[PDB]
Design a protein around this ligand. Structure first.
Ligand SMILES: CCCCCCCC/C=C/CCCCCCCC(=O)OC[C@H](COP(=O)(O)OCC[N+](C)(C)C)OC(=O)CCCCCCC/C=C/CCCCCCCC
Lengths: 151, 48, 52, 151
């Protein structure tokens, strides 16, 4: 934990950029400059398909990036605003747990490794379906439940 | 007229190949549609 | 007039049979929860998934 | 039992709808107007072959969606008139347990997921076979015994 950085704006934080493996994850819909000076200077390749902005970590100096994994067994995970529960192909939370302005928050498994980065959520009544950027064995994927709004 | 009448039936001229072409195209479309219908019917009837 | 009328009616019957085939080959996938329609069958029968 | 997601659909109660997975499911032979006065306004696709009818669940009640699964190991399952046993490729209940008007009752595994939806059944003395719809991997099916009738 504590490896993430808030992407700062003029007067408030609009999202969170996470360090995973050797890439500086950052959602693309959120805009800002990133707090840390060096990270702001990297070339961020974008993709509207996956709503992501990533760049090679200066791994010569950043040797603290979070571990990652590709398997997502159904169970319970945590995202620093509570505990996210897995079911089928959705992530659900208590309705008030999620809030705008905290998009890009990494979510971990029980062993302290990230599995997905939240982009937004759809309030389903009691639960909130999370739109996340995860990855399978090979390549990233964007699970977007119906009616999910950006954060 | 020295000859007989034109013809009591279907003595239209060559370049009725237009008729043959349009009828053949429509028949091909109908045959393809019927084949698709019967193959999906066989698939749905196998399912139980 | 007769030839034009029947031919357009023939293509109408063909398109109707195509629609019926699409309905009867797609409803099993519609009823089943999970929505695992393959990409190939979605393209062939001209349907889209709920995550695209 | 421990989770309510069913709704009736007629002033004279005959048949019920369920919130299974991402579909609101109601058997075809029953007729009526699904309550809460919004679900009945949904567009419903029907198939007289399977005696089934479905519609997309509105995002409002995605939280109320019941979990479901496709495996049906031999054993005992419970519904709202007691318990059933999936013995020998058939769902069977003790005679007299079911009666007309009981279609649309789900059938649950011990973990609370849905594995079946009852339409009716026939009796052989002390026991009674069931006519039920179920879904294997990716495709629903319908199983019916000899001399059954709609409930
Ligand atoms: C769903 C809809 C269903 C509705 C059903 C529709 C029914 C409508 C019809 C009723 C029929 C009307 C007939 C009117 C009475 C006429 C009687 C007649 O007096 O009959 C004249 C002769 C027929 O002689 P017969 O055999 O009866 O005598 C033998 C007599 N018996 C058989 C007893 C021995 O007729 C001739 O000979 C004249 C020959 C002239 C040939 C003209 C050629 C026209 C060709 C056009 C082709 C177009 C070009 C194609 C370009 C396409 C490019 C895309």
């Amino acid at each position: 934990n504590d490896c993430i950085f808030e992407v700062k704006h003029e007067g408030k934080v609009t999202g969170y950029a996470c360090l995973v493996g050797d890439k500086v994850m950052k959602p693309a819909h959120v805009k800002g400059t990133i707090d840390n000076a060096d990270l702001a200077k990297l070339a961020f390749k974008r993709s509207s398909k996956y709503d992501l902005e990533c760049a090679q970590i200066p791994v010569h100096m950043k040797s603290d990036a979070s571990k990652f994994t590709h398997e997502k067994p159904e169970g319970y995970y945590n995202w620093h605003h509570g505990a996210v529960q897995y079911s089928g192909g959705r992530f659900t939370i208590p309705t008030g747990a999620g809030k705008p302005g905290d998009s890009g928050r990494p979510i971990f498994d029980n062993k302290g490794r990230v599995v997905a980065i939240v982009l937004g959520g759809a309030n389903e009544g009691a639960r909130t379906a999370l739109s996340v950027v995860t990855w399978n064995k090979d390549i990233v994927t964007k699970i977007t439940p119906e009616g999910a709004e950006e954060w | 007229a020295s000859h007989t009448t034109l013809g009591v039936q279907d003595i239209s001229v060559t370049a009725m190949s237009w008729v043959q072409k349009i009828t053949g195209g429509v028949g091909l479309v109908v045959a393809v549609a019927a084949l698709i219908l019967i193959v999906v019917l066989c698939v749905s009837f196998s399912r139980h | 007039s007769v030839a034009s009328f029947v031919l357009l009616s023939m293509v109408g019957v063909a398109v109707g049979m195509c629609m019926c085939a699409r309905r009867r080959c797609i409803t099993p996938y519609e009823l089943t929860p999970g929505a695992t329609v393959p990409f190939l069958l979605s393209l062939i029968c001209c349907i889209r998934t709920a995550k695209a």
